Q: What sequence folds into this?
């Protein structure tokens, strides 16, 4: 093809069609302004054409997937095998050979579409866990390409990874890249150890740095670079948006509609068993039972975005969370005044920002999360320096946001102590923490992340 | 003893101590004003004395029960064997011989306490399913006594009753009475058939009337009278109470606190699997899904009084209902505005009356209920002629309250159609129904009921 | 059509094709020898033709049903609504309007096929719970016909029947017959009461006799006869078959293959929650635990024929029973010697007869069963007068087989006592019981049953 | 005290009393023959004395534990927190603060008993996961002691270990030792990484060898040695025992009692969710379904020893396995001939050896296991060179027994392929493998293991 920079991701960067706002596709804009750029992905509709679509800024290459393809490659292998395994088997992975076979077939199709788009010697950046076979497949089709891969979810310890019957194929798949990146040094180090243990490759032994001190894996005549690049957001843009009059007005209206509580706790997540929503609710219930939170002036809002309804584990999770909600309100609410407000629906971005602005305590308590950008978004929104972030240690974000109230979500006693502390912090202490968190997040944005990864990738040439 | 009229019931008519208001004990007041009256029952505290307590109006005879006695006789045999069996095995009865043995032992203890209190030739009125052995035991101890028994819960069909391993002992127990009463002719007729089938007694074959046309069972030289006496409330007293300024003010405040909805649906029940609370919630959810109820101006309040927490079936039921609540609000509510308000706690009587006055639609949808006085209380409160009663056919109340919106709770399509009809009735049609229901309930009160039963019992002399 | 006697049943009397042996179709042979006979039913294959098939003896009229028809009318309405409801709601019936609508549509199709076959003034005999609408539909199409209906499963008490949202339609459906028959007087009496309560018809009030003393329901100008006709088997034929050399040789071989136990208990059932298989296993386990049965010389064989695998309740039941089997053997067996042998597969008739001949104790312990012919078959096979029948009271068979060891399956203590008694009976006492049971079963066979029903039906002319 | 060599373990090496045979206590005999030896442990009876008991060979120091102590420290913290966590969270660990507090209290009690027994400068060897706090506690009480600790179960990856709310306390506890040993280099390397990540200690970075190339952790002025020492059995003694006439006679009798099958598969385990018993049964069922194993001449014997009945996860596991057993026999067995024989009971050692000798295929398929000595015992018993070992990769044993048929138990397709391969191996290939496995196991016995650990520990002086 005629593109010298190519992104490969499970989905095209569109909404159903118009270009989706923000995200990676926006972070890359000033590179696409000087490159012949392409994006390979599934357009989100079954059995579409694979005819290229010019976006002026980008050229989009659609990948044809049937509904059955999506069921077995995506909702099957990706979300019911890889997702739970990589997130510390919070639920039991399902090992299914037909899912594997479709995952291979679909990965090859992405590889073919990439080659079609990629000019000679082009730079290719493959995204995330659905496409781990693509780098090797692409190198075999197109040895002229420079190939980067970034994993957005955690890379699990070897003891868990080894469960995968296709462990070697996945590892070889990733080793097809010139650069393999993870959010955290821990993931990079697991990958190095896996390369030694499973594949028998020679690797570097030193600790892996942050955006520096890269590891290496020797594969025959070529070297694979391994690095840690923690993703972030467009901090400045969110900071700006959150100051808008209409957002501030909505935040005040939210508090009014909640009956003007003294304190609002907020959870914002896709409904996933990795997110520790159940832990927040358990902690809140026990605090109310113990009289350590005031049921008359404190309210918890949980906004759950529907996710993966076709996967049974998610339906069961929804059932447990919805039981907790009903239970806590039945026990501690009053007619016309719940202590927990729970919504299971998509939420417009501007409404979410208004909730960040209204919330006195942000509860981000995943059991395991690659990064978690909701924590960083809350921080970027609080230019008033109000609020408080309660953050699980088991997120990538916890490595950068040390000034937050950090918790081990498995330590329920300390989660409860911490929620009380966040709710009752002095104004000055709250400001001190938020000021420090904002300094970090404003300085370490998605632009820094993307430039760091691409600089590392370019250096493999 | 020195009492010529004696009531026998599982509990003494007290709150923990002071005399409990209303109820049977108040209905009997003008008889106790001309009788030497006694009440036999458990005082609600473990291992108490059995020393008589003069209430001036009554003499109370406490029955000593240990916590283990209560666990096996009451929460065991009474509530986990008899209760589910008599209510059409909505949950599976547990047949446990140790529970049976304690039930016999405790029933004998009540019989002994009764004899202690009862003067020669005294009239005795035994209450309800916990004490079905007492009449026979008492007749053996005291053949001089006139003995009535009234069952407050349904009497099941023979096909289900026969499951009970101690079916014959229970039947003989009831046949010790001079008069056996039920709310409905159906129960009386089941009892007659059971007497023929199981005990081989000669009985009458005709239909049993309401407070008339009594059946009979011949037991050797004596005859057992069998009748239907549908219980009611002190209709006039509730009518009066509901007109009080403070009640009306509270009802307005309730509507204000709910955000001034156009329509309020109300459920008021002890949390029991017989009450069909799950059906109301399912119907409401599907109506919202179908857009047939307006989620912006219609709200459902369910007040569940905690019941029998030590019984596993009740804990599981609570879990399912609380899930439904959380689910429906997550799907159709807004932050600061649920469509379902659910409270799991005891509610003061005056607060309940205020809710009756506020509610546009009363949802009384049991799967099976002896009478259900909540339906009649709602009617007695609506002297403004507003409101609407949606009532399950499977209640004793449905035989008298035919002007209500009657439903088969198993027919979910018709339950949904009926809720829409009740919510959207014309003012005139609503008034027509409520006027007719009030005529019935005001005329057929607890006084009429108690006099009818005691007249029938006296006639056995 | 040209048939003056017509049977209507869910399935044609064939195996897939050849005529199925025994059963109703064989009982009717000497009537078909003097009649122009027809049989209407589904041939058991989806979307077949409805072209008549001459069997010389009979003419078969196939009813076309699609796989979807079978799923909603048969496995849906018939087996997941009616079956559990009529058997005392051992599992919760599912009320589904789409199932109902298909049940109506399919019943009409059977009615149309019947009319096609039936000559003018012909006699029609409709079979069982799948076809309860056919009599009314047929009378409307063909008022010239004489119509009988026999229900092979129990008819439930009114309190349970009334749950059915289409209760009135089913009742009207049955009332289309000139004769409605049940195995037992109890079913007939429930039907009479239902006719009065639900339909408001005038009925007889007397007890219903066995093959006599019929009840009646007045429907406008015509009368519906109601009777009890307990089904049986071809007793003489089974008695004869069980004496065959090869059967006796197989029975000895069975005992040899079980390691020559002193005592064999046997269960033979379709795998259904009505059959009380779980109760047998629980009783056997507790007897072994208590050392009241000798684990070294006593063995229990349970032969479960697979049934209704597409219905979830049956899959769950299979799971529980299979757990019990594994558990009991793990606890009381030895390697090479289980105490329970369990087979989940169809069993050839001649193999079943050999098991009847080998078994010292026959365990027939349904929670609820219309008749249960397995009990009568065991009796007919034991012309050696050996063996012992343990029989649930909750079967139609218990009304005729009073000399068996009768048990209330809910009374587990007595089930256990009874199994010990049967296992250890003296030879003389065993013979006394078996001799008496055989006198009853040899005299009251399927021929007597069929003649009695047809005589009653003919008398409605 | 007066002992210069002291073993510390959860239980005293006795049966209830007499000295228990074999095991660690026998491996140490020639050291105790030249040492003043002591053993500290719970005698297995509640609230005993702590008076020392001379065994001539050893002095036993009993630790007093109440039944409540055992419930919270052992069945609670040890078996419901640590056990599932360290075995890759196959079931969800329970984090309970009261269990933790009792675990600390009990560990201190063991430490106090050790100090009481230990002479000045004595060598102390603490055993296993129940006693991980003891080394630090002991060093604080008795800085004069040389302290070794060996973990017999796996040491989990840091991502899982970090869940533990008392992660730091456990790690500090282990760091109190002069030598920390694990079966495998992987465990040692996890420990080193944990020491760096959690405790911030300086450690060695190199790979850890087998009984060599030790790691180190610097703790202030002292160094902690870290090593891998894979445990084994008394190979020669078992080899000798398995040749006994009575054992060989019993093995032949076992095959006779199974109906002389051509092939016997054997599983021998404590009933634990770590052991992968469910996987064996699933594989066997699918092979039978596929006709790849002959149901007429192949039989699977599973001997499950009862374990931890007071822990709910184990009761649920028992239920699932027992269901599988019942199911497979119901589907593929014949009356008098199951395809699966399952026993849930303790088995005498001599009976187990006879089963090893009889078994054609040994199925050792844990999901995760520290070592698994059953695999090595089978090998030591087969001096006839018959048999075949199917072994999970996820055992310590798989690192030494590479000549076995190794399987990933999560790869069910390959487990099935492998069982077929083992069942149908040529005699020569079977012998080749068994000969090689025996060379390893005969050379690497419990004596080599114990000497290696004690040499390493002595070198810390
Ligand atoms: O499953 C697709 C998900 O991808 C994103 O989340 C992952 O990537 C983020 C950015 O690197 C991380 O913050 C996060 O921890 C990862 O799980 C996306 O944000 C999610 O909405 C998607 O569900
Ligand atoms: O279990 C005790 C219950 O007794 C009452 O309810 C029964 O008696 C009422 C009056 O006859 C009926 O209306 C009702 O249908 C019966 O269940 C009491 O009202 C309940 O609160 C108690 O739970
Ligand atoms: O569901 C069809 C079943 O019909 C028969 O069983 C019923 O009819 C028998 C004869 O009247 C009774 O003995 C029995 O109690 C009824 O359930 C048939 O025998 C069964 O195999 C069928 O499952
Ligand atoms: O829970 C106590 C268990 O300890 C032993 O098992 C562990 O130690 C063995 C020897 O090091 C290993 O083979 C094994 O993998 C470990 O789990 C003992 O053998 C078990 O019976 C005990 O359950």
A:
């Amino acid at each position: 093809g005629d593109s010298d920079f190519v992104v490969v991701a499970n989905r095209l960067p569109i909404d159903l069609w118009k270009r989706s706002p923000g995200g990676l596709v926006t972070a890359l804009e000033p590179l696409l302004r000087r490159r012949r750029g392409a994006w390979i992905g599934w357009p989100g509709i079954p059995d579409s054409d694979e005819d290229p679509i010019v976006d002026g800024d980008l050229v989009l290459y659609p990948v044809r997937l049937s509904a059955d393809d999506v069921a077995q490659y995506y909702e099957g292998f990706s979300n019911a095998t890889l997702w739970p395994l990589y997130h510390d088997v919070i639920v039991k992975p399902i090992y299914n050979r037909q899912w594997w076979e479709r995952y291979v077939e679909v990965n090859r199709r992405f590889a073919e579409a990439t080659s079609r788009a990629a000019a000679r010697g082009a730079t290719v950046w493959v995204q995330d866990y659905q496409l781990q076979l693509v780098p090797k497949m692409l190198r075999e089709l197109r040895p002229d390409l420079t190939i980067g891969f970034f994993l957005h979810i955690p890379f699990p310890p070897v003891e868990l990874f080894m469960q995968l019957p296709w462990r070697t194929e996945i590892t070889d798949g990733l080793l097809g890249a010139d650069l393999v990146g993870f959010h955290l040094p821990g993931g990079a180090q697991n990958f190095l150890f896996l390369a030694r243990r499973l594949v028998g490759a020679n690797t570097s032994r030193a600790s892996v740095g942050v955006r520096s001190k890269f590891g290496e894996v020797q594969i025959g005549s070529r070297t694979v670079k391994v690095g840690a690049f923690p993703i972030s957001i467009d901090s400045a843009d969110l900071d700006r948006q959150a100051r808008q009059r209409s957002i501030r007005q909505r935040a005040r209206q939210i508090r009014a509609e909640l009956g003007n509580p003294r304190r609002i706790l907020l959870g914002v997540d896709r409904l996933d068993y990795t997110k520790g929503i159940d832990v927040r609710l358990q902690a809140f219930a026990e605090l109310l039972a113990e009289g350590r939170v005031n049921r008359e002036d404190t309210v918890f809002v949980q906004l759950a975005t529907p996710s993966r309804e076709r996967v049974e584990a998610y339906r069961l999770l929804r059932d447990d969370i919805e039981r907790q909600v009903g239970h806590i309100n039945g026990e501690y609410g009053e007619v016309g005044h719940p202590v927990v407000h729970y919504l299971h629906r998509p939420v417009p971005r501007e409404e979410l920002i208004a909730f960040f602005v209204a919330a006195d305590v942000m509860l981000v308590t995943p059991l395991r999360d690659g990064m978690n950008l909701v924590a960083k978004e809350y921080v970027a929104c609080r230019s008033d320096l109000g609020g408080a972030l309660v953050l699980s240690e088991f997120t990538g974000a916890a490595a950068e946001l040390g000034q937050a109230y950090l918790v081990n979500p498995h330590n329920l006693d300390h989660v409860k102590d911490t929620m009380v502390a966040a709710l009752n912090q002095t104004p000055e202490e709250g400001r001190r923490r938020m000021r420090a968190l904002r300094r970090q997040v404003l300085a370490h944005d998605v632009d820094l992340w993307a430039r760091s990864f691409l600089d590392a990738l370019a250096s493999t040439r």
